[PDB]
Amino acid sequence: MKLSEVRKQLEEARKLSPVELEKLVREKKRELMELRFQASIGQLSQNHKIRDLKRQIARLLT
RNA sequence: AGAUGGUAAGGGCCCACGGUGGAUGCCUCGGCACCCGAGCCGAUGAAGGACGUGGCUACCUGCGAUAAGCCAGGGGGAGCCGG
Ligand SMILES: [Mg+2]
Ligand SMILES: [Mg+2]
Ligand SMILES: [Mg+2]
Ligand SMILES: [Mg+2]
Ligand SMILES: [Mg+2]
Ligand SMILES: [Mg+2]
Ligand SMILES: [Mg+2]
Ligand SMILES: [Mg+2]
Ligand SMILES: [Mg+2]
Ligand SMILES: [Mg+2]
Ligand SMILES: [Mg+2]
Ligand SMILES: [Mg+2]
Ligand SMILES: [Mg+2]
Ligand SMILES: [Mg+2]
């Protein structure tokens, strides 16, 4: 389900949409690096975090 | 004075049981022929590729930095994150 709650308001992100969507896409991309960094060091990441964070940015990126 | 036994280093034929080898039978995811259908793609970048892409990924498959995937419509009704 996750998606709906998000993707719905992701469109609703039409307050300052495209611009806020760029800003948003970045924070989502920084959180990703932090993740692959912590996953890099070994015990400090638990999988799906990255997958879900990726696919999020993909629709987020629309 | 004479006469004729035994020995098998090894060999040979036969029997039994194995080793090696992959014939024979059965099998079939594939192939073959015919018939019917269907018949163009490309600068809106084709055909075909290269390098990438998974939390751990050698290869195959998929995909393309939104990267085994994103959106929506339809199908479907308990399982799902390919091999
Ligand atoms: Mg989805
Ligand atoms: Mg005598
Ligand atoms: Mg005698
Ligand atoms: Mg003998
Ligand atoms: Mg002897
Ligand atoms: Mg002997
Ligand atoms: Mg025996
Ligand atoms: Mg034999
Ligand atoms: Mg034999
Ligand atoms: Mg066949
Ligand atoms: Mg043309
Ligand atoms: Mg191609
Ligand atoms: Mg590949
Ligand atoms: Mg697909």
Residues contacting A58, CB < 8 A, separation 6+: none
Cβ neighbour number for residue A9 with a 10 Å cutoff: 10
Q: Are the CB atoms for A38 and A45 separated by under 8 Å?
A: yes
Give the span between the Cα atoms of A26 and A32, in whole angstroms. Answer: 9
CA distances A62 to A10, A23, A25, A46, A55, Å, are 9, 13, 10, 27, 12
Alpha helix (H) residue ranges in A1-62: 3-12, 17-40, 49-60
What is the radius of gyration, based on Cα positions, of chain A? 13
How many CA atoms are closer than 13 Å to the CA of A8, on its beta-carbon side? 5
Resolution reached, in Å?
Answer: 3.4
* Strand B proximal to A54 Cβ, under 7 A: yes
Method: X-ray
Looking across all nucleic acid strands, the nucleotide with the smallest C1' to CA distance from residue A4 is: B71
- What's the token pair of residue A56? 């999020």
Nearest-angstrom CA–CA distance, A13 and A17: 5
Q: A30: CA distance to ligand 1 center in Å?
A: 22
Q: With 0-12 CB in 10 A as exposed, 13-18 as middle and 19+ as buried, what is A38?
A: middle
